[PDB]
Assembly symmetry: D7
Homo-oligomer: 135 residues x 14
């Protein structure tokens, strides 16, 4: 019961740092050796922070229109005291370049480790919609 709810809590804090363009908070949540699969990387496994830094600097820190995000049907696996995995469906509501409301879907997996009494993200996999909305 209580152990699964803190993995939901850290996952929601991560997603809001990305919404705000808050790269300084986002960098505290990630392990420096973090790896990623996502639609922007063209089928390659990316490692470290500098691929994501470009989207913070050239996009996410600049934009300011309303967005709403929903997490659907989260499933949590707990792998002892120091490791967890979460999988969920993500729906995004956003405003397009004509001012009309639109919707998109992605499927996401996140893997969490507990060094030094702090939860940090070690691997991420994303399917479906790109992170940049087609406004």
């Amino acid at each position: 019961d209580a152990r699964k709810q803190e993995i939901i809590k850290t996952t929601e804090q991560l997603i809001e740092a990305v919404n705000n363009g808050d790269f300084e908070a986002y960098a505290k949540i990630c392990d420096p050796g973090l790896t990623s699969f996502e639609p922007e990387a063209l089928g390659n496994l990316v490692e470290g922070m500098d691929f994501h830094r470009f989207y913070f600097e050239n996009l996410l820190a600049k934009n300011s229109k309303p967005i709403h995000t929903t997490i659907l049907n989260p499933h949590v696996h707990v792998i002892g005291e120091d490791a967890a995995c979460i999988a969920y469906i993500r729906l995004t509501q956003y405003i397009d370049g004509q001012g009309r409301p639109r919707t998109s879907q992605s499927e996401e997996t996140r893997v969490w480790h507990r060094p030094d009494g702090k939860w940090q993200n070690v691997h991420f996999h994303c399917s479906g919609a790109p992170v940049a909305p087609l406004q």
Copy 2:
């Protein structure tokens, strides 16, 4: 060094059970609560074994043509003594319905847990090519 190589060993034993259509060996490797994201499930999170059983019975146990599989650039995260995560690129070589050799690519993540001294799979995510080849 030695701990990462046994996660490669169990991952290669899993992939060959699927190639052989060996559902009885495959069922020993999986946790009964296993969850999955894959191209056949249309963006839904599937749970348990019975969605996969259909592909064993109606396809993988029947087919017999030559296939070759390559694992490229595997990255392993070790999360204490009892948990691990592996991510890799998979290339498949197969023969089409005209008899011509063809190639396809997928991106895969697998999450492993160590109950009772035996490694078992708890979550899987797949991107790119479907598991049924377009022969």
Copy 3:
């Protein structure tokens, strides 16, 4: 006779609160645990009010052009004293971005429950046209 007409009355009061962008009246008509199937949710079952709040804030409270709505062939099922179901065809007449009159169709089911002597909506299903008109 008289019991079916008050289910038509609450259904017509609901549709007009949406036409007016009156989120404060709409929130009194809905159970807090309300679930929905609709074309905007991409085949997912949505729960609660916050998915709909976005369309009130970014669209329905802002727009002001003439719209007319017709309810065709309503069928009512009465399931004791405290529960009812209504199903109907909905035609919408609206003005497009060039100023021309246009028409669209949807099929709708609504499920009603009577806690505390007040009728409240518990589930909704929609087919056909989206709620945002293609002006």
Copy 4:
């Protein structure tokens, strides 16, 4: 707890009578005044059994290939002692006219009433895939 599980039980017994082409069992589960929205009815509300009887006689009682069905994320509303509503996502796995395995999705709502101590279906709404698979 226990009351929601018998609404899942009757819903699973209904779906299997349709899979088997068992019109005599299906006719005991339905109220004679049953209404329906579905993709085959071209946006019209159908009433009674004779629209469905045609698919039993000309299709479902004749076919015999393997099919598998999954119910995802069922949500149940209980509306006193004698009424209930269930909503879920349905995945179908089937074999096509070339012998290849395929998958399709629908969204379904079912409304249940308890006359004479027996649960019977009074209204049904379906979205997404047709009931006849595109083999």
Copy 5:
């Protein structure tokens, strides 16, 4: 009440004579000066029986596969003792040239007159699907 039901009765007897290819029964129901608008006449008003006789002789008397017909939402206007008008939606279920079940829709108006104590059809208008199904 009772007067509207005999206009439904004659309308259902007319439609079944066409289903059976029974030109001798159909010719007793029609006034010899009958006029028609229908999709086969290319936007022209047809008069008399000989345009319809061709579809009896070359098609409707020859075919023998299962068909089912539904009349939806019939509205009846009664214009004294000797005249009536009926309007309705018609759904047809039929088997195609591959043996698959299919559905089509038309909108129909029929005008009835009561010479010599017998109801006879004087004008007909049809919209939507052709009378020959696209098998």
Copy 6:
């Protein structure tokens, strides 16, 4: 001879009230229970005046360009002293958004009843061109 000419007279007075956008004259010609089939209603039977009121308010009372209308080959059925039916082809000549003259065709049926010594319209069916011209 003389009885058919007054059904042509009322039909021509109806069409000119629509050309002028004169909803107050049009409302005197129609029975309050009037039903309609037309291309704007998407295959549904409409009842009463309020579906048509929208086209008077948002279009027909606003527009002012030249239009010419021709009634071709009218056929009249007389069904005693108090009822009649008329069927005809309608050609419309109008000016488009570039200022060029254009032509369109429809097929129309109108049913007339004589309550209180005044002819009133009880049912209407239209095929072919929409009532809003594609300027």
Copy 7:
């Protein structure tokens, strides 16, 4: 009255000689200097019988499937005692190469002269469908 009916009589006798492939009867009805506009002549004015003789020899005398023809709304101009003109719409019902019934339309003008007490055709113009049906 009676003079217009014999121009309808000769026009119906002409059309049936073409249906039968009876070139010997057709040649008695035509003036030897007859001229023609028709879709087969590619926008050229043809003169005499030998252009039409080819369709008798290579087609109309060989074919034997059922055809039905309707003359709609014939208008007759009478130009003294010895000359007349007739204009009408022609509908053809025929069976295609798959055995299905089909319909086509043409517009026709015929000019008649009365040498030697016998009516003969001097000019013909045709629009719309070709004389060879697209079976």
Copy 8:
């Protein structure tokens, strides 16, 4: 010889009244019961002057750019003292909306009668290009 040349003379005077937009001269040349087949009438036979009056008022009396017309290969049939028929190919040269010279073709039949010592047109048939040029 001389009788055919006055039918060419009246035909050339008719075509120039249309070029000039001179409806008052055109109305003296036509019989009040004149009938027409032409591309603008959508396959219908038109009667009288008011269909043509619209093209005089909204187009032919307004336009003023250069046009040239050629009559090719005129064939004349003379049907006693009081009736004639003429058939010909018509080529039109005109300037488009970009200022470029363009060409179009039609095929025309005209039927002439001699009441009261004045030649008047009783029927007209046109094929090929519309009378409104595609500038």
Copy 9:
């Protein structure tokens, strides 16, 4: 009068030698220095007989189906006693590979010279349809 008719006579004798595949008669009609423009020569001026000999040997001497040819509106220029030019429209009626009758058009110019008291062809130009029909 009489001089133009012998240029029509030699032109008709030439066209029939080509229809028959009679290269020995065709070679007597042509000057050995004959030049040609035609659709088969891809925009090049051909000289002599050997380009045409290939169509006699590989096509025109082998084929045997019915063909009919019409010469329309021939214009003849006479350039003294020993030279003439003829220009005309040619219509061909032929049977296609399915057995259906078809029509095609060409425009032709022929230049004639009178050495040794015999008319011979010195130049030819063709536009429109190819000489090989698209059967």
Copy 10:
């Protein structure tokens, strides 16, 4: 030798009068009974000067951009003392509506007669490019 060069001389003087828009010089070179085949006449044989006068007045006398013309491979037939024929390929270089240089090709035949000691053109045939360039 010398006789062929004066037919080249008159042909080059004709082409330059058309380039200059010099209708008064062009009219001295042509016989009043001149006939023509060309791409602008839609497959019809034109006679006289007035079809060409329109292109002088509305185009060739107005335009002023650079054009260059080449005559390739001219072949001359000499038919006594008073008649000649010339055939050649014509290449035109011109500037388009964007200012870019472009090229087009035509095939041309010209027939010359020598009345009154002056060479005049009696017939012309053109294939390939139109005379109006697609600028």
Copy 11:
């Protein structure tokens, strides 16, 4: 005069060795260091005989259907006593895979040198049609 005709003679002997598939005669005509530009070499300069040997062995020595070749407008440059260049247009007539006669065009340049008293080919360039006909 006489020197240009022997360059035409060797060029015609070369083309016939290729038509016959006579690689042994063709190899005597070519310098061993011969270079080529042609459509089969994909924009590359080829050197020597072995690229051409493949078309002799796998095609030109096997085929046996009728072909005819024309050389148009040959231009010869003579560069002293021992060197020449020839340029010409080539038309090929051939029979396709359905048995129909077809035509194609190429542009060709050939460079000739006179070692040891024998003319031999040193360079070749080809444009337009491929050497393998599209049968």
Copy 12:
């Protein structure tokens, strides 16, 4: 060795005169009887200077943007003391109408003769890209 390098030297001096629009230098390099095959001449052999003069006057003397040219793999044949042939691949780098750098390819053959102690060009053949770049 040294003799091949002066044929490269004259070829590079020719290409730069064209780049500069220097028609006066270009005219000294060419024989007055020069012939050409190139993409602008539509498959015709051109002779002399005036076809090329148009591209100097209307284009090459006007333009001024940066261009770079590369000669790849030049092959030289030497045909005594007074004649040579050169063949090469040409790559052009240029700036388009949006300011972006682009690349194109051609294949070129040039034939050189040595009258009066000066090398002059006698024939040219070009394949691939046009000389006017698609900016």
Copy 13:
């Protein structure tokens, strides 16, 4: 001079082992750590022999039709006594599935090292055509 020719010799021996399907000779030429870029590997760097073994077993050892290969413009870099690099264009001539001769192009780089007195291949890069021909 002599050192570059033995790198051409080993490169030609490698290409012929692949043509013959001689995997046992091919395996002696390659370093066991060999890496590859090629069109079949979908943009991935492959390592070792087993990716290539599949094309030997399922294709190259089975096929037997004629193929010819040309190496164009080879450039060799020599990097001391024990290392070399070669780059070239490769043209392949082959017979398709209809028996027609076809051509394809690739660009290739090969890197050679001299361990133990034997030249072995350490890296390969390929662009353009796939190694499996599109027969």
Copy 14:
């Protein structure tokens, strides 16, 4: 270990000189005889610096928007003391002409030689994306 890291160091210094448009630093890193395969050269092997100089002058020295580059999975072969080869995947992140972030991929091989104690590049091969981004 240490020897492979200085080949990564020189490769990263090369890529940054190109990013900066620093042709003077780039020219010190390259051997004057450098050869290249790349997408801009249309399948040709380029030699020397002047093909690349054009992209420095007309593009890379002018542009100034943000770009980020990643080197993935570099593999290094060491071929004695004085020669090395490196192969890698390159990902580029850039801003398009609308200001949106975009990604592209290439595959690259570089060959390094150590004359005079300084590493210099001797050959380069590139596949996938062009070096000019499609902004």
